[PDB]
Structures are given as C-alpha cells and as structure tokens.
Design a protein around this ligand. Structure first.
Ligand SMILES: CCCCCCCCCCCCCCCCCC(=O)OC[C@H](COP(=O)([O-])OCC(O)COP(=O)([O-])OC[C@@H](COC(=O)CCCCCCCCCCCCCCCCC)OC(=O)CCCCCCCCCCCCCCCCC)OC(=O)CCCCCCCCCCCCCCCCC
Ligand SMILES: CCCCCCCCCCCCCCCCCC(=O)OC[C@H](COP(=O)([O-])OCC(O)COP(=O)([O-])OC[C@@H](COC(=O)CCCCCCCCCCCCCCCCC)OC(=O)CCCCCCCCCCCCCCCCC)OC(=O)CCCCCCCCCCCCCCCCC
Ligand SMILES: CCCCCCCCCCCCCCCCCC(=O)OC[C@H](COP(=O)([O-])OCC(O)COP(=O)([O-])OC[C@@H](COC(=O)CCCCCCCCCCCCCCCCC)OC(=O)CCCCCCCCCCCCCCCCC)OC(=O)CCCCCCCCCCCCCCCCC
Ligand SMILES: CCCCCCCCCCCCCCCCCC(=O)O[C@@H](COC(=O)CCCCCCCCCCCCCCC)COP(=O)(O)OCC[N+](C)(C)C
Ligand SMILES: CCCCCCCCCCCCCCCCCCCC(=O)O[C@H](COC(=O)CCCCCCCCCCCCCC)COP(=O)(O)OCCN
Lengths: 250, 205, 308, 226, 51, 82, 80
C-alpha cells in the first residue's frame, strides 16, 4: 500500500478512485525510483501515458492513446521515432534469449497504431505495421518493415532490407533502395510535422485548472481547506515505521 | 574605371614629378636606430669573424634541443631502482651531439653565405639560397631518396622567407603613414598634423 | 524535523497562507487585478480563435462510472446506487449501476470501467482498458491483470440462452491490446498481446493463447495447450516450467499494480510538494554548498535532520 | 484566403496566450499555484487551428473518445470510449447511424492518405484500425480488422474479425471476407443482410443511455465547481 | 523583493537591498558635494545658496 | 562488402608496436617545473643577447624545429639501459 | 552617428525573440510578450550605443585638436 522507502517519501494522503470527481491522469509521471526523461521537442499527447525509466530522444512523438510503460525495464526511443495512436511499448524484466530486456527503439522508427512492442530491439529506419506484435527478444535489424497484422515470435530476427508479413512472420520481398533510403525516413518526418503542429497550439498551463481551483476556493471561503505540511508528515511517518519495525517480535 | 571600353587603373607621367612635402611639421621618432652590435654581427666582410659571431645562436638552440631530449630520458629513469649504468654517461652524448651537429649546420650556412657575398660582391637572394642549399645537402648526406631533394629546398627556402619578410617588406612600406594625408595624395583635404602620433616610447627592455 | 523556522512559502508551496503584511496584501490585490485582466484577454482571444475557442475543462472520472439501471435485468456483478435528488428531478433516473471493486484493486485513471463489472482483490485494470458492462455483467477474479488498451465486451443472452457474460478467472493475464468479447477464461491463463477472443470461447486452465491470435467463436481451448494463428490452432503443449511463468507473471503484475496505485493515488498538494522535494534534491547534490556545512538533510524529504 | 485565416489564428492565439500568462502571473502574486496541476488536459472534441469537429445533435461522443480535426459526424452516430478519430491532415466523414466502437482508430493522418469516408449504418469493431478508406452503407467491420488506405468496402458486406485489407482492394457487396490477406469466404445469407439495421438501431439506443449517464456525470462535476 | 521571493525571503532581501543601494548612492552624492565645496568641482549653486 | 584500403603489416605485429607505448608514464609537472624556471631565467638573459640577423634567426628556428623530439617519441623508444 | 540604428535595433530585438524560441524548440510565435520586450529594449540599446560612440568621437576630436591636429571647421562638422 504505502511504500515507506520511496525516493520522495511515503504518501501522507491517498485518495480512492471512487472519490475522484475529475480525471487526474498525468502524461508523464514517476514510478518510484524510475524517472522518464524527455527532450524539449518531444510531443506527448494529453491522452498518452509515459511512466517509468523511459528516455525520449529529440523529435520523439507520442500520439494519442499510446502507453509507454517503463516499469519493469528501460525503454529508449530514438531520434525522430513516432509512437502512433493506441500503440503500447512495454519492457519485460528478463528476456527469454538471455540478452538485455530493455526496449530499444532506433531512429526514424514508425510504430503504427495498436502495435505492441515488448522487450525488442528495433533498428534504425524501421516500420512496424498496424496491430503488429513484436515479442520479447525479437530483434528487427535496420531498414526492415513488418506488415500490418504480423507477429514476430520470441527470439526471432528480421534481416535488414526485407519486408516480413504473416502471423508466423515470413519473408515477402526485399525492400527497394528508394524505399529504404527515402520513404521510411519520410514517414517519420511527416509524423514529426504533425506533432510539431500539435505542439504549436498547446498552452503551457491550459485553462482546465480553473475548474478545480473553483472548488479549492470554495473550500477556502467556507473554511474547510486545511494546510498540511506534507514534508514533516512524511518524516514523522517514516520515523514511526522505523520504531515499529524495531519493536516487532516476528 | 569599372567599364568594358577603356583599360582599368591609370597611368602617372614619368616626366612630371611632385615635390616631397613633409607628413608633419615636427617629426618625433620612437623607433631606435640599429645598434653597433647589430652592425658588427651583420658584417660579413671576414667570413671567419661572421661565422664565429653568429654561431652562438645555433649552439644555444642545439643545447636546448639536447637538454629537452636528455630530460625526457632522465625523467623516465627510476630513482627508486639503483641503476648499474651511469646516467650522465648515457645523457651527455645526446646533448653534445645535438649541439655539435646544430653548430656545424649553422657554421656551413653562415660561412657559405659570407663567402658567396664576398665573391659575388653584391647582396642578393642567391647567397641565402646557396648557403641553405649547402646546409640542407649536409643534412641529407646518407638519407633516403626524397630527402636529398627536400632538405636543400627547405633550407634554401628559409633565407628567402627571411629576406622577403625581414628586409624587403619593411623597406617597401616605410613611407605609408596612416595619419594626416595619404602618402601619394597630399592634394586631398585631410586634417594635417603639427606632430606625428607617438603611440609608444622607444623600448628599453 | 530539526528546524521549525522554515518559511511558510517553503512549507506550503501549493497555496501560500493568507497575506498578513501590508506589502503581501498589496501583492494579493494586484494579483487579483492581473487574474481578471488575463481572463478578459483570454476571452477576447478565444473570440478570434473561432468555434470552440480552444476551451478546456476537467474530464469526468470514468474509472468508476455508472450505467443506467434496468428494472427488468437486475445487476449481477456490480452494485446499484441511488443518484442525487436534483439529478433525479433533471434526468429522471431512479438508480444507477456502479462497478464493484476491492480495496487492493488498482484501476488506472485513464481506464474506463462501466457498470456491471466486478473486480477482485489484487487485480489490476491498466491504462486505456475499456470494460463495458452496460448490457451484461463482467466478472474478473483475483490477481487478474487487464493490461493497456484491452477491450472487454459483453452482449445479451438472446433467445437461445447462450451465456454472453464475461467471466475471467484468477491469476489470468490479458496481454496489451487484446480484445475479449463475451467469453469464459479459466484460472492461470495467459492471453497474448493482440489476441482476439470471440463469443462462446472457453479457455481451460493452464493454457496459453498466443500473441495476435484470433480464436474462432464457440471454440474450446483445452487445458495446458498453446494455440496461435489467425484461425488459432494448436502448436504445442505448455511446458512444466511455463506454468511457473504464468504464475510469476500474475504475481509480478500484482506488485506492479501496487506501485502504480501508490503513485496515482497521491493528492495534488502532495504531488507538488514531492516535485519540490525532487528539485531541491537536485540543487543539494553539490556537497560544497554552505548549507551542507550547516546541516545534514533527510534523504526522502530534504529537510534538515541533524547538524553537521 | 488561407493566409488571412492563418494570420487571424496567429493573432487570436497570441492574445489568448498572453491572457493566460497574465492570469498565471496574477496567481503567482496571490500565492496560489493551482495552475501547476498536471491533470488530464484531454478534450473530446479538439480542433486543429480552424478545423473543428462538426457534430450532430443526436450524436454521442464519449468523454474518453478523441474526435480531432475536421470530422463531420452525422446524426444518430456514436464514437465510443477511447476511440480515436483523427481528421487533422485530411477530413473524416461518418454517416448516419454509424458506430465507432471502443479503442478503435479511424484516421487519415498519413502523408498520402485519401479522405476517409464512412457510410450509414456502419459499425467499426473494437480495435479496428481504419486508415484512408471508403466504407459503403450497411457494413459490419470486425473487432480487429485493419483496412489500409485507398481500399474500398462496398455496401452490405461483413469483414470477419482479424482480417487485413490491402490497399486498392475492393470488397464486393453481399460477401464475407476474412484472413490476413482478405479473401471472400461466402456470400452473406439473407438474415445477416437484414441484421445490419437492427445492429445500428441497437447501438443508437445504447448510445442514448450512455449520453444520459454522461450528463449525470457532468452535473456531479458542476456541483463541485459551482 | 522579486529576487528574494524566489528564495522565500522577499521582505528581508528587499529591505537589505534598499538600504545597501541607498547608502552607496548617498555616499556618492556626498563625495560629489564635498568636492564641490572644496572647489574641485563646479560650485556656483553652492556658493549662492550658502554664501 | 566494400573496397577498402590495404593496411600494411600484420595485425599482431602492429599491435605489438602499439603496445610499446604502454609504459610507466611520468607526471608532466617535472618537465613543466624545469621549463618554467629555465624559461624565466632565459627570458631574463634574452634581453642581453646580441641582435641577430633575421636570416640567422630563421635558420636557428628551422634547426630547432628539426632537432625537436616529440615527447611521445622518447616515450615509445626509451630503454632503461646503458 | 548611424542614422539607421533604431530600425536595426528593433529588427535585432525580433532576432532575439525568434532565435530564443527556436533554440528552445518552440515556434517563432510562442511567448509573444518576449517579442515586445526584446524589440523595445533592443531599440533603446542600439540608440544608446550610438550616442556613446558619438560622445567618444567628440572627445577624441577635442583631444587631437589640443595635441595639434589642425582640424578644419568642416572636419569639425564630421564629428557631430
Ligand atoms: C631541462 C628542461 C627541459 C627543457 C630544456 C629547455 C628549457 C626551456 C628553456 C627556455 C624555454 C623558452 C624557449 C624554448 C622554446 C619555447 C617553447 C616553449 O617553451 O613552450 C613550452 C614547451 C612545452 O609546452 P607544451 O604545451 O607542454 O607542449 C606543446 C606541444 O604540443 C608538445 O607536445 P609534442 O612535443 O608531442 O609535439 C610537438 C609539436 C609542437 O609544435 C611546436 O613545437 C611548435 C613550434 C613551431 C615553431 C615555434 C615558433 C618559432 C619562432 C621562434 C622565434 C625565434 C626566431 C624568430 C624568427 C623565426 C621565424 C619563424 O611539434 C611537433 O610535432 C614536432 C615538430 C616541431 C616543430 C614543428 C615545425 C616544423 C617546421 C619544419 C619544417 C621542415 C619539414 C619539411 C619536410 C616536411 C615533409 C612533409 O616546452 C618546450 O618544448 C621547451 C623545449 C625546448 C626545446 C626547443 C628547441 C629549440 C628552441 C628554439 C627554436 C624555436 C623553434 C621551436 C621548436 C619547438 C619548441 C617547442
Ligand atoms: C541592436 C544593436 C546592438 C546594440 C546594443 C544592443 C542592446 C543590448 C541590450 C538589449 C537587450 C535586448 C535583448 C534582451 C531582451 C530582454 C529579454 C526579454 O525579452 O524578456 C525576457 C522575459 C522572458 O520571459 P519568459 O520566457 O516567459 O520566462 C520567464 C518565466 O516566466 C519566469 O517566470 P517568473 O516567475 O520569473 O515571472 C516574472 C516575470 C516573467 O513572467 C512572464 O514573463 C509571463 C508573461 C508576463 C505576462 C504577459 C505580459 C502581458 C503584456 C504582454 C504584451 C504582449 C502582446 C502580445 C499579444 C497582444 C495581446 C493583446 O514577470 C514579468 O513579466 C515581470 C514584468 C511585469 C510586467 C507584467 C505585465 C504587466 C501587465 C501589462 C503592462 C502593460 C499592458 C499594456 C498592454 C497589454 C496588452 C498588450 O520576458 C519577460 O519577462 C517579460 C517582461 C515584460 C512583459 C511584457 C510587458 C510589455 C508591456 C506590454 C506591452 C506594452 C507596450 C510596450 C511599451 C510600453 C511598456 C510599458
Ligand atoms: C519587425 C516586424 C518583423 C519583421 C521581421 C524582421 C525581423 C528581422 C530578422 C528577424 C528574423 C529572425 C532571425 C532568425 C532567428 C533564428 C535563426 C536560426 O535559428 O537559424 C536557423 C533557422 C532555422 O533552423 P531550424 O530548423 O528552425 O532549427 C534550429 C535549431 O535551433 C537547431 O537546429 P540544428 O541543431 O539541427 O542545427 C543545424 C544547423 C547546422 O549547423 C550549422 O551549420 C551551424 C553553423 C554556424 C552558423 C552558420 C554560419 C554561417 C551563417 C551565415 C549567416 C547566414 C546569412 C548569410 C548572409 C551574410 C551575412 C553577413 O543548421 C541550421 O541551423 C540552419 C543552417 C543555416 C542557418 C544559419 C544562419 C543562422 C545564423 C545565426 C542565427 C541567429 C541566432 C541568433 C540567436 C538569438 C538568441 C539565441 O532559421 C532559418 O530558417 C534560416 C536562417 C535565417 C537566417 C537569418 C538570421 C540572421 C543572421 C544573419 C546575420 C546578420 C546579422 C543579424 C541581422 C538580422 C537582421 C536585423
Ligand atoms: C502597479 C504599481 C503598484 C504595484 C503593487 C506592488 C507594490 C508593492 C511594493 C513593492 C513590493 C515588490 C513589488 C512586486 C515585484 C515582485 C514581487 C514578486 O516577486 O511577486 C511574487 C511572486 O513573484 C512573481 O509572481 C513575479 C512577479 C513579477 C512582477 C509582476 C508584477 C509587476 C508589477 C509589480 C511591480 C510594479 C512596481 C512596484 C511599485 C514601484 C512574490 O511572491 P511572495 O513572496 O510569496 O509574496 C506574495 C504574498 N502572498 C503570496 C502572501 C500573497
Ligand atoms: C611564399 C614564397 C616562398 C617561395 C615558394 C617557392 C616554392 C618553394 C620551393 C623551395 C625553393 C627555394 C625557394 C626559391 C624561391 C625563389 C624563386 C627563385 C627565383 C630566383 O632564383 O631569383 C632570385 C630572386 O627571387 C627570390 O628569391 C625572391 C622571390 C620570392 C619567391 C616567390 C614569391 C611568390 C611565390 C608564391 C607562390 C605561391 C605561394 C605558395 C608557396 C634571384 O634574385 P637575386 O636578387 O639574387 O639576383 C641574382 C643576382 N645574384
């Protein structure tokens, strides 16, 4: 329930989901000791959720509904790589192959909507199609494309310059020089332009806080608002927990 | 001119001359004249005397180079370990040979320069080129194939650079002033100075 | 803590206490003027911006959200609750079905859990998961993980009497982006990421449904078998160690849900205070600062603990 | 022209930005820091510049759903929870009685995407990805169906769940298609042909119930705010 | 006040800065006036005002 | 596969040549101390040097540059031997 | 001195605002208040720099006239 060794301390007040009267979901938030890192030009949609040890490089775009959970292990998304709508990127604690279980995404990688990536190595200039599942330990080498509705089984490899399709994904054709050189990069650049557009009409603190401030001001006016020194309470709770842990016999 | 019809530039009459006019009414000089020691060292009349006056520079440079190398060796030798060999017996040949070979090269250079100037009877670029060529030839006696060509060329080129930028350059631009009126053009209406600017005193360090 | 003279702005960063000095009162009044002028300028800009004006509002909490109660079809999984009287004289609904969850359950704020949904203890509904029990009940057992962007759907039983409720057993893992319509899942089953389980499908205990596999309707996946494919077909039997993996995945996601529930459940004032804790942790990383000579600071909350 | 509209948008946006900054400065002077709250800034009907979602009176758009850009939704249509309808780059049209189900993406946001058109009585399954395609009247799309750009689905057709439609592939009328490369399985029998309108009207009834409940949620929020 | 509020001590920083700058500029003015009295600087107004 | 430059020498022989640079490294203060001291005294003595012809100065600079040994060269080739 | 100093200063204030937005990843139109502030301060600073240059030009003219440089009335007109 309460993690007393949490980096910022125990939680003085925890509120239940039933008691919430508005949506408080944060697009970037810290899971215990793991902190997501982002560049200046990284676009995270309001719907999107990014938590854990996720490192977002420059020109990374996280579109609406995408969930990038970096709780079990590290996720790295390379430069100008776009995670499109409702696409989940997650990392496993360990990989079946025995290699590193981090989810590393290279540069100019487009993950199409509803595609699931878990503990995979995605090389530079790659496209993962819509509803394509890349399982743990699967490695896509650079300049390779996975067609929509295809599954890369755990510990499998897609060679460079190749298009792969099917539920047991198989070789279809060799990607042409024009494709690998231009179009794969161009798709990521297009989605960067779209995300740049979305960033340009975003206010730093959009006027949704006013509604909650109205409730807080009403509580202040009726004298129910309470001022709590959370820092001191965290210190006191940790002290009490240590004393109790010393006292216990079993 | 800035047109395609008549030649650019201009011409000055050779018959017509313009009377010199002083850059300023009173001239104050902060540049000191050459010392008697400089004229003594520059004198190439007696080639032996000229050589012996100018070699201390070469011997000094060879001594610094040998000292640099000898210290690089000395720094490496371990004080904690007692050494069977004598360090100075190892290090003295370095410094002595560097100094001797530097002095020999400088001696060839100065002697050939003075001998050529005496025989030619004129001060010219060619004396420096020939002295440098001889010095570079002595540098590359037993050296592999590119070096018989490159060292005479480099050692000859060095006095050309020294003559071009040490003697010709200063003498070419003595007249140019930078204040008052341009040296060629005094007819133009520019502020005329009573006295030349003194930006610094004669140095004494 | 060691000191009690900390500035009130430092102790209450979320909201500074009522101004007491004259200068503070003047600053408060000037802030009021600035706030009103800024709102006026905001509305003037919104006029030029066109239809919508780029207005923003707080969103409803859909993790614990009701559905219309049917007098004919009584609730099966969720509880039924009355609604406020004023909403009664506006909307006219007498009662509304609400989801039923245990205290240990973690539901993400993003997730939409609606109506006839019963969720057991230590189960987790993750981000983007939509659980609609509007027409029929949804039951989820203990230590069951509905992962990100999973859609669980139900239908009406109809004349045949075919059961169109969704019953998910204990220790069941539903992979990310999987779609589960009115099917039955037994205990200790992994549903792969992207897998589609249609109507009438009974998946027996100990089985694994592969990633991106569509199991055809009215298909029984027997116990201890792995089924993959667009027309999902049997490939191999579950290895004895893979069973221990199934349990390990369930338990690992239980711990994960506890952590995520702990992070999300903090109130705003505590979150802002924790942001300041992280910030002055970063500022205090330099150990040659003058204040470090003065005191040793508590690690979790950078407050002076003891003098140095 | 378009340039005039761009200039008007930039001027209005600058004014609104400065107003919000001044309001934040006033809050800082007062000592209130509620503006620093990181809450869900998601809007169900977002606009990109002057392109805003046109919406019918009887339509139901879920609060968690995102209808973005210029998307024209006809009357008695429903975009359900966590459904993403993107029409910024190219517009998206949805006909009367059509339903977009939960966790479904319909968009025309690729560079070369055609304008997405969805006809009347078209139900998109939960999880289906539709990109730059034309869907005709009375079409049932499966749960997890992928339909690629420039692909055409003719009237009175059902796409089985999990089917992927390659581009420039026409799905003909009165047919059932399935498979990762979509191929015709069987001709639709008469009962399924009649089932389309019943499915659509049931979806509309369900949407009306959900709209009533959503209004209830809004009144509860209003009680706190005011 | 502006700089001190960033450190949660606005009032004290404001008073200290005011005192500091006022003292410095007052000493500068007094030095100028003393030079004017000594005759080093222009003093026509001073000689008229205090004969 | 691409056309590549031919590398003269064997891999292990070249690596052995490169490994002769891995020797005990003195700290640079020892050289710097002596250079600073003798340089200060040298600058004091230079003001008393006779004025030399520019040609001789340039030749002396050339000889010094040719005679200068890089510190790495002594490092690789140093032997603690007679 | 320069007769185009203020116009240059205003344009350079625009340069400051737009460059600061671009370096930080923001678009040129973001943070509008920075534009007005940058323009006004840059215009004032460019003007002030011009008067400072003119003043020290005149001080140099006075010094050289004291020293003995026979500057004419027209040359005195060159230095405003
Ligand atoms: C007991 C103590 C031990 C020291 C004993 C002496 C103690 C000092 C006493 C007095 C010191 C004051 C005077 C000494 C010289 C001043 C230098 C100094 O003190 O700096 C601190 C220096 C250490 O500083 P550092 O930062 O640690 O080292 C930097 C280097 O990177 C170091 O790293 P690195 O060694 O690994 O790299 C060296 C690098 C560093 O680079 C340099 O050395 C720069 C030197 C360039 C010339 C310097 C300016 C010359 C102007 C001289 C002015 C007087 C004449 C005026 C007219 C001349 C017109 C030019 O150069 C090279 O790579 C090797 C080539 C060396 C010359 C390069 C030019 C070649 C031109 C020849 C062309 C022919 C080739 C043609 C064929 C080519 C085929 C393609 O200490 C010394 O080196 C002093 C050693 C004394 C030996 C000098 C021997 C001759 C001295 C007079 C001749 C002048 C020429 C200069 C030769 C090189 C001198 C470095
Ligand atoms: C060229 C050749 C070279 C030769 C020599 C060159 C010379 C070298 C030197 C030259 C150097 C130039 C380059 C450096 C430029 C300086 C950097 C810079 O641009 O500012 C940096 C700095 C960076 O801001 P930041 O990026 O947001 O980061 C600070 C953080 O917020 C940090 O937050 P914080 O906690 O630190 O917050 C403190 C600060 C920072 O807070 C903020 O900055 C937030 C924004 C402030 C509130 C928004 C300002 C409201 C007015 C802005 C007007 C924009 C119009 C555009 C849209 C039109 C709307 C109808 O708050 C302040 O703004 C303090 C100033 C108090 C004034 C506040 C506004 C008073 C109400 C308006 C007064 C008059 C209204 C009349 C009309 C109003 C409507 C037009 O900008 C400011 O601090 C702005 C201060 C002044 C605000 C604008 C007020 C202008 C007056 C309204 C316009 C009336 C016409 C103007 C003429 C008449 C004047 C009265
Ligand atoms: C009043 C009503 C308003 C009317 C308007 C009137 C206003 C007057 C003018 C105001 C307009 C705003 C000025 C623009 C500010 C930002 C410019 C910028 O960021 O550059 C790139 C920026 C676009 O870059 P980006 O894609 O947005 O990403 C940039 C990221 O930050 C970093 O991206 P990255 O990390 O990938 O870097 C890759 C980089 C590759 O890496 C490099 O190549 C670096 C090379 C070093 C610099 C280049 C050296 C050569 C530059 C020559 C100058 C170009 C003009 C040539 C004419 C000859 C002039 C003598 O490639 C580039 O960045 C672009 C290459 C070409 C641009 C180089 C020119 C920039 C010069 C310096 C900019 C000014 C910054 C001021 C800072 C303000 C405070 C922070 O602007 C452009 O679209 C093209 C450059 C436009 C040049 C105009 C700037 C004036 C400089 C001329 C000097 C004359 C004196 C100034 C007088 C100005 C008039 C008063
Ligand atoms: C318009 C003229 C009158 C202006 C009224 C101010 C006169 C008061 C006397 C001067 C006091 C200092 C002036 C304020 C400047 C900066 C003060 C400041 O930093 O503002 C805030 C925080 O900093 C900011 O928000 C930045 C504000 C920047 C300046 C914006 C105001 C611009 C006009 C004020 C100065 C105009 C000239 C003042 C008179 C010459 C201070 O935070 P707190 O220390 O917590 O005090 C607030 C008290 N309480 C929370 C308890 C209610
Ligand atoms: C940067 C210049 C360095 C020279 C580079 C040349 C190529 C380097 C090869 C090394 C060869 C040694 C240098 C010899 C160059 C001198 C040219 C030879 C011409 C020549 O012999 O005439 C002498 C005068 O020229 C002279 O000695 C003075 C001429 C100045 C040299 C040319 C200057 C421009 C060259 C720039 C080319 C491009 C720069 C890239 C390096 C004799 O004259 P005299 O008075 O003795 O009469 C004789 C009465 N006994």
């Amino acid at each position: 329930v309460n993690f007393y060794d949490a980096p910022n301390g125990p939680a003085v007040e925890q509120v239940k989901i039933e008691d919430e009267w508005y949506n408080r979901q944060r697009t970037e938030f810290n899971i215990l000791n793991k902190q997501p890192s982002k560049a200046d030009d990284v676009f995270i949609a309001p719907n999107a959720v990014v938590c854990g040890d996720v490192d977002l490089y420059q020109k990374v775009s996280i579109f609406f509904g995408a969930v990038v959970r970096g709780d079990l292990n590290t996720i790295r998304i390379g430069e100008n790589s776009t995670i499109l709508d409702k696409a989940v990127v997650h990392a496993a604690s360990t990989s079946p192959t025995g290699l590193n279980a981090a989810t590393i995404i290279g540069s100019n990688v487009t993950v199409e909507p509803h595609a699931v990536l878990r503990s995979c190595r995605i090389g530079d200039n790659c496209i993962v199609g819509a509803r394509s599942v890349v399982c743990e330990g699967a490695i896509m080498h650079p300049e390779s494309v996975l067609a929509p509705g295809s599954v890369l089984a755990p510990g499998r490899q897609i060679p460079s310059g190749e298009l792969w399709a099917g539920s047991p994904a198989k070789f279809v054709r060799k990607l042409t020089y024009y494709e690998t050189s231009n179009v794969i990069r161009e798709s990521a650049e297009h989605y960067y332009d779209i995300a740049t557009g979305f960033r340009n009409e975003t206010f730093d603190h959009g006027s949704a806080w006013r509604d909650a401030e109205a409730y807080r001001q009403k509580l202040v006016d009726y004298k129910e608002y309470n001022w709590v020194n959370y820092r001191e309470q965290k210190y006191v709770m940790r002290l009490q927990r240590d004393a109790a842990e010393l006292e216990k016999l079993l | 001119t800035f047109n395609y019809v008549i030649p650019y530039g201009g011409s000055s009459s050779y018959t017509i001359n313009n009377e010199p006019v002083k850059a300023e009414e009173v001239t104050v000089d902060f540049s000191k004249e050459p010392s008697a020691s400089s004229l003594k060292l520059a004198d190439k009349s007696d080639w032996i005397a000229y050589t012996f006056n100018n070699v201390p520079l070469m011997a000094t440079v060879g001594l610094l180079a040998g000292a640099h190398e000898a210290f690089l060796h000395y720094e490496r030798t371990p004080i904690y370990g007692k050494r069977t060999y004598n360090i100075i017996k190892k290090l003295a040949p370095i410094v002595i040979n560097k100094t001797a070979y530097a002095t020999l090269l400088g001696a060839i250079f100065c002697a050939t320069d003075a001998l050529y100037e005496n025989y030619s009877g004129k001060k010219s670029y060619t004396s420096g080129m020939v002295a440098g060529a001889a010095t570079g030839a002595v540098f590359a006696i037993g050296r592999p194939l590119p070096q018989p060509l490159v060292w005479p060329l480099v050692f000859a080129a060095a006095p050309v650079i020294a003559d071009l930028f040490g003697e010709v350059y200063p003498e070419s631009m003595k007249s140019a002033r930078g204040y008052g009126t341009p040296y060629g053009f005094e007819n133009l209406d520019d502020a005329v100075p009573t006295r030349n600017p003194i930006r610094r005193n004669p140095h004494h360090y | 803590s060691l000191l009690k003279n900390y500035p009130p702005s430092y102790l209450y960063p979320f909201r500074h206490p009522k101004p007491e000095g004259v200068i503070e009162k003047v600053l408060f009044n000037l802030g009021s003027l600035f706030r009103s002028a800024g709102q006026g300028m905001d509305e003037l800009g919104s006029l030029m911006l066109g239809n919508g004006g780029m207005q923003e509002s707080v969103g409803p909490n859909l993790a614990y959200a009701p559905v219309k109660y049917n007098p004919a079809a009584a609730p099966k999984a969720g509880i039924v609750a009355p609604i406020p009287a004023s909403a009664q004289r506006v909307l006219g609904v007498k009662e509304i079905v609400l989801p039923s969850k245990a205290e240990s359950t973690f539901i993400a704020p993003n997730a939409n859990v609606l109506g006839d949904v019963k969720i057991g203890a230590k189960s987790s509904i993750w981000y983007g998961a939509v659980l609609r029990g509007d027409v029929n009940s949804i039951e989820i057992g203990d230590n069951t993980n509905v992962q990100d962007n999973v859609t669980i759907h139900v239908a009406k039983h109809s004349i045949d009497g075919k059961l169109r409720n969704t019953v998910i057993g204990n220790n069941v893992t539903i992979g990310h982006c999987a779609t589960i319509h009115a099917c039955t899942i037994a205990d200790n089953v992994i549903i792969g990421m992207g897998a589609t389980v249609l109507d009438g499908v009974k998946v027996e205990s100990g089985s694994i449904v592969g990633a991106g596999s569509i199991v055809p309707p009215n298909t029984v996946i027997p116990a201890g078998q792995v089924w993959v494919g667009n027309p999902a077909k049997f490939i191999r039997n579950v290895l004895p160690e893979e069973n221990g993996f199934i349990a390990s995945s369930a338990n690992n996601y239980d711990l994960l849900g506890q952590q995520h529930k702990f992070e999300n459940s903090k109130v705003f004032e505590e979150m802002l205070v924790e942001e300041e804790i992280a910030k002055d942790r970063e500022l205090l990383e330099d150990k040659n600062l003058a204040v470090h000579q003065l005191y040793i600071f508590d690690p979790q909350t950078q407050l002076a603990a003891r003098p140095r | 022209a378009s340039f005039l509209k761009t200039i008007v948008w930039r001027c209005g946006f600058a004014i609104k930005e400065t107003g919000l900054a001044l309001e934040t400065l006033g809050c800082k002077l007062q000592g209130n820091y509620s503006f620093r709250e990181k809450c869900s800034r998601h809007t169900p009907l977002t606009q990109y510049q002057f392109k805003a979602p046109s919406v019918g009176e009887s339509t139901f758009v879920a609060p968690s759903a995102l209808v973005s850009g210029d998307v024209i939704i006809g009357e008695k249509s429903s975009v359900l929870y966590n459904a993403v309808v993107r029409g910024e780059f190219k517009s998206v049209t949805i006909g009367e009685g059509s339903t977009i189900s939960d966790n479904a993406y319909v968009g025309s946001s690729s560079e070369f995407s055609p304008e997405t058109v969805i006809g009347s009585n078209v139900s998109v399954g939960s999880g289906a990805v539709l990109k730059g395609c034309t869907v005709g009247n009375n079409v049932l799309i499966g749960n997890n169906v992928i339909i690629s750009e420039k692909a055409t689905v003719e009237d009175n057709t059902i796409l089985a769940p999990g089917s992927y439609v390659p581009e420039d592939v026409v799905v003909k009328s009165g047919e059932l298609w399935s498979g990762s490369p979509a191929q015709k399985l069987r001709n639709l029998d008469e009962k399924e042909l009649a089932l389309f309108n019943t499915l659509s009207v049931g979806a509309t009834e369900l949407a009306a119930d959900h709209a009533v409940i959503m209004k209830l949620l809004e009144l509860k929020q209003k009680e706190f705010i005011k | 006040y502006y700089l001190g509020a960033k450190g949660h001590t606005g009032k004290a920083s404001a008073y200290f800065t005011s005192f500091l700058a006022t003292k410095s500029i007052t000493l500068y003015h007094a030095y100028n006036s003393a030079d004017r009295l000594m005759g080093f600087k222009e003093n026509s107004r001073e000689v008229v005002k205090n004969v | 596969d691409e056309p590549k430059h031919q590398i003269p020498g064997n891999a292990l022989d070249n690596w052995a040549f490169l490994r002769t640079y891995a020797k005990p490294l003195p700290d640079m203060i020892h050289y710097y101390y002596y250079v600073y001291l003798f340089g200060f005294f040298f600058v004091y003595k230079v003001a008393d040097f006779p004025e030399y012809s520019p040609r001789v100065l340039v030749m002396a600079a050339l000889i010094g540059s040719l005679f200068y040994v890089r510190r790495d060269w002594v490092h690789r080739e140093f032997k603690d031997s007679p | 001195g320069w007769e185009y100093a203020g116009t240059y200063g205003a344009l350079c204030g625009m340069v400051y605002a737009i460059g600061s937005n671009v370096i930080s990843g923001r678009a040129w139109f973001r943070r509008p208040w920075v534009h007005v502030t940058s323009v006004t301060l840059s215009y004032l600073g460019s003007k002030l720099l011009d008067e400072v240059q003119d003043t020290y030009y005149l001080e140099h003219l006075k010094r050289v006239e004291r020293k003995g440089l026979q500057v004419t009335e027209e040359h005195k007109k060159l230095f405003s």
